[PDB]
Coordinates of C-alpha atoms and ligand atoms in Angstrom, one line a residue:
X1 CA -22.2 -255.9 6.9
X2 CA -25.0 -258.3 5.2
X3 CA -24.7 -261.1 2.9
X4 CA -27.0 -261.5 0.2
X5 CA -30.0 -263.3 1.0
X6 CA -30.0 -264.9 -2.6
X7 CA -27.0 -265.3 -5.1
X8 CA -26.9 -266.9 -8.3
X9 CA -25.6 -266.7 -12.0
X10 CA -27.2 -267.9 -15.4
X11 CA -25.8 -269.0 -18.7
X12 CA -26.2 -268.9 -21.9
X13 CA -25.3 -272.5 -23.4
X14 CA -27.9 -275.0 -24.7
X15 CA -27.0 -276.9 -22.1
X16 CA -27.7 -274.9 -19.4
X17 CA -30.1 -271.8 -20.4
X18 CA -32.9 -273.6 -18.2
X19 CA -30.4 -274.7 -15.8
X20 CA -30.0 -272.7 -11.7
X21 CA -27.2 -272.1 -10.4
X22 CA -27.8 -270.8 -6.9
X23 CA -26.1 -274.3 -5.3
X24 CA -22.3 -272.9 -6.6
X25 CA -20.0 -271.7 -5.3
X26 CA -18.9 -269.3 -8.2
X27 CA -20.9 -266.5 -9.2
X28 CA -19.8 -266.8 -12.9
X29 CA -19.6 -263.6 -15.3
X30 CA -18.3 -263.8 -19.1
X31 CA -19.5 -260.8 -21.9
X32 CA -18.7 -262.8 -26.0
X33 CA -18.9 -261.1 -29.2
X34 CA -22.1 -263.0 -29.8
X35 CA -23.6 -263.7 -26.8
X36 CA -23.0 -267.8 -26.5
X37 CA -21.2 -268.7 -23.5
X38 CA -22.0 -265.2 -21.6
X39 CA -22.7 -265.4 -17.7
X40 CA -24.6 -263.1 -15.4
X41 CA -24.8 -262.6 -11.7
X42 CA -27.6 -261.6 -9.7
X43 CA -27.8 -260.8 -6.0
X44 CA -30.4 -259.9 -3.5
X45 CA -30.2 -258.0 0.1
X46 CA -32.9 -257.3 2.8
X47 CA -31.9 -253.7 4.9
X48 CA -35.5 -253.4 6.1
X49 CA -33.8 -254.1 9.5
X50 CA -30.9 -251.6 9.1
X51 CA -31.6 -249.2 12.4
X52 CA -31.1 -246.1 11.5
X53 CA -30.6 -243.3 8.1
X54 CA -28.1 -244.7 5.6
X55 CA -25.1 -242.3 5.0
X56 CA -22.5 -244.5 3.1
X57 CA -23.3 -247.9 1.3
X58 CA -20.7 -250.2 -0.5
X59 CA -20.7 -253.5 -2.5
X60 CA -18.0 -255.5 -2.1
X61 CA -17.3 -258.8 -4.0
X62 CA -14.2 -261.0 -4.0
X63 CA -13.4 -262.6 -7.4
X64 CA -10.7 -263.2 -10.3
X65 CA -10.8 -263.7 -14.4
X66 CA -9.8 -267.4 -14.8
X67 CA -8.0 -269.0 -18.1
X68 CA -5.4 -271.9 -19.0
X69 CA -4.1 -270.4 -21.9
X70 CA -3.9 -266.3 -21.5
X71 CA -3.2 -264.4 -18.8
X72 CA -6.5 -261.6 -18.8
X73 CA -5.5 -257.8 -18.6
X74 CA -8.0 -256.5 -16.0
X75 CA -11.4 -256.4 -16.8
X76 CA -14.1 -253.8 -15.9
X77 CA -17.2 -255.3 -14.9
X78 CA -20.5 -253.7 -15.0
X79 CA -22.8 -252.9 -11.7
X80 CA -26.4 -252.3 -12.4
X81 CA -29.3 -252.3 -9.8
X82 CA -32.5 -253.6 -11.3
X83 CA -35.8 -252.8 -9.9
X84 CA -36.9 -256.2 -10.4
X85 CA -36.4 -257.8 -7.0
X86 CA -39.4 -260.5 -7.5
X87 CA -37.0 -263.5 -7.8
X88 CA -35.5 -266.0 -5.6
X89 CA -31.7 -266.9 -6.2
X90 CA -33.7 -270.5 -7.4
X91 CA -35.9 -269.1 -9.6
X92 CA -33.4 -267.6 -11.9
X93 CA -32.6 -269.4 -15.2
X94 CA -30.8 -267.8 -18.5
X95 CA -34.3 -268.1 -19.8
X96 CA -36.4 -266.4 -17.1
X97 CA -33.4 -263.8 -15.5
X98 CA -34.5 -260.0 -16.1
X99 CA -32.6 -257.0 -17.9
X100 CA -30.7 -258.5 -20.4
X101 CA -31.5 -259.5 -24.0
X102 CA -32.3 -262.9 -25.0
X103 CA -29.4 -264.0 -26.7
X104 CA -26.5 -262.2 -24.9
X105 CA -25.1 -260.4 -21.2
X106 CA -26.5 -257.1 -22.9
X107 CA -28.7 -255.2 -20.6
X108 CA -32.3 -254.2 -20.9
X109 CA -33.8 -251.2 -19.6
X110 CA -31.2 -249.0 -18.9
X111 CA -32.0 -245.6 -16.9
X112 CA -35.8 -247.5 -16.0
X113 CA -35.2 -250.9 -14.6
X114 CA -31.5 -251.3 -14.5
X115 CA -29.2 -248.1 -13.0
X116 CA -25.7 -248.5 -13.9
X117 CA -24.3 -248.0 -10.8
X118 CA -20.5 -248.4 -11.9
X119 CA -17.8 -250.9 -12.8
X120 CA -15.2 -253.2 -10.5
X121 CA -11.8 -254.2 -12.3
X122 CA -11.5 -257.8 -11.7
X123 CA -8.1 -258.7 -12.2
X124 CA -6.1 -262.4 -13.0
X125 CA -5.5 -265.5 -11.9
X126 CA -6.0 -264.5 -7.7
X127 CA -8.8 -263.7 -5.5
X128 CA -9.1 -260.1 -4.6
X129 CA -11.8 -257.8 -2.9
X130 CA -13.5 -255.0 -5.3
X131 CA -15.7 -252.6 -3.9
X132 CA -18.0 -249.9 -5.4
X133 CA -19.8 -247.1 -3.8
X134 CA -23.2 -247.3 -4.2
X135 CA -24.8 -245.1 -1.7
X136 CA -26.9 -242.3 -3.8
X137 CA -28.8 -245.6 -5.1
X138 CA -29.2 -247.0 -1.9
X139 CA -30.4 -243.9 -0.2
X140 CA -32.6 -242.1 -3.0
X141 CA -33.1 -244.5 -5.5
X142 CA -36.7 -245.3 -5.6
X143 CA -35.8 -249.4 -6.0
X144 CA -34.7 -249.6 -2.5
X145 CA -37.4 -247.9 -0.6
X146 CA -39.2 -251.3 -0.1
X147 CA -35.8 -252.5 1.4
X148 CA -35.1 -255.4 -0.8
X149 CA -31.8 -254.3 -3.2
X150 CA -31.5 -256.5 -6.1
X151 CA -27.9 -255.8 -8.0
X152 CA -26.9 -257.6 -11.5
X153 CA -23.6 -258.4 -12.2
X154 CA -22.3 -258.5 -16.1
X155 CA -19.3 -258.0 -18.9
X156 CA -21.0 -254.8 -20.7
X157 CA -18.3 -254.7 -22.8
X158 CA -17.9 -257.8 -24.8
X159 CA -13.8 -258.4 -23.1
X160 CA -14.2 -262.5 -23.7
X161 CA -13.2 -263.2 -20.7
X162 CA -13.9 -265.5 -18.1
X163 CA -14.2 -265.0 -14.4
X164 CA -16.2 -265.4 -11.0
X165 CA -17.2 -263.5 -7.7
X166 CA -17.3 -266.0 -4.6
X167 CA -20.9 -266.3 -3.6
X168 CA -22.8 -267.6 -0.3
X169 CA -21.9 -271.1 -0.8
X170 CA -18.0 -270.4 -0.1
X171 CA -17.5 -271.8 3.2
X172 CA -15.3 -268.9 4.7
X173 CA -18.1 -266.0 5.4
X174 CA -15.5 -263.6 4.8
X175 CA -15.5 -264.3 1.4
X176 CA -19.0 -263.5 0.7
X177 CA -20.4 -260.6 -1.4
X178 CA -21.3 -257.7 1.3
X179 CA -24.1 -255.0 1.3
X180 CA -21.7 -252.3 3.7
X181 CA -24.5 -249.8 5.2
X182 CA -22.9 -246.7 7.5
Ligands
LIG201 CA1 -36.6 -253.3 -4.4

């Protein structure tokens, strides 16, 4: 069970696109038509001390979609792992984050630099737990042989709809996103 070593989000308002976010509680996500307004999460683990061969590895996240005025149907959101792991969660900025576009959530370098490694349907209004399965990426994928993982977190799909994973700064542990290595 490991937390992240670094979590943060970025954001795309005028505002904010030079702004870091690692001090939050909230690891914010939100895919728009246009791309104003979209958040991305990013994540970072060390297993360069996990004993032992990996045979299963999850992600798990805890999080919700959030609005005053519309209850959300659930929304899938998207999973990549990026091999650009050079950051710290205090670096990152909308204007300096890697794998998406300039303007919007969508990704850059699919299939090279970013593996889709699935989607977790976050769902309204209460906190729940998603988990994905990552392990053929965490065991072969050539990203994580220098055992630091770095995962992105994203709406692929332009829903318009706002949510947030808990991140580090949550002070119940439990509620923490967590690397699961078996
Ligand atoms: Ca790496």
């Amino acid at each position: 069970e490991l937390a992240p070593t670094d979590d943060t989000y970025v954001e795309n308002k005028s505002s904010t696109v030079d702004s870091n976010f690692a001090t939050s509680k909230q690891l914010k996500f939100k895919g728009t038509s246009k791309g104003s307004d979209d958040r991305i999460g990013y994540l970072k683990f060390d297993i360069s001390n996990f004993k032992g061969e990996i045979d299963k590895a999850y992600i798990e996240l805890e999080g919700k979609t959030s609005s005053s005025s519309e209850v959300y149907p659930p929304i899938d959101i998207s999973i990549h792992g990026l091999t650009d792991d050079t950051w710290s969660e205090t670096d990152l900025t909308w204007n300096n984050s890697p794998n998406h576009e300039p303007g919007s959530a969508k990704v850059v370098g699919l299939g090279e630099t970013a593996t889709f490694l699935g989607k977790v349907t976050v769902n309204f209004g209460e906190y729940h737990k998603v988990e994905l399965d990552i392990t053929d990426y965490i065991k072969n994928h050539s990203d994580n042989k220098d055992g630091i993982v770095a995962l992105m977190i994203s709406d692929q799909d332009q829903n318009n709809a706002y949510g947030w994973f808990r991140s580090t700064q949550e002070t119940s542990e439990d509620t923490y996103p967590k690397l699961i290595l078996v």
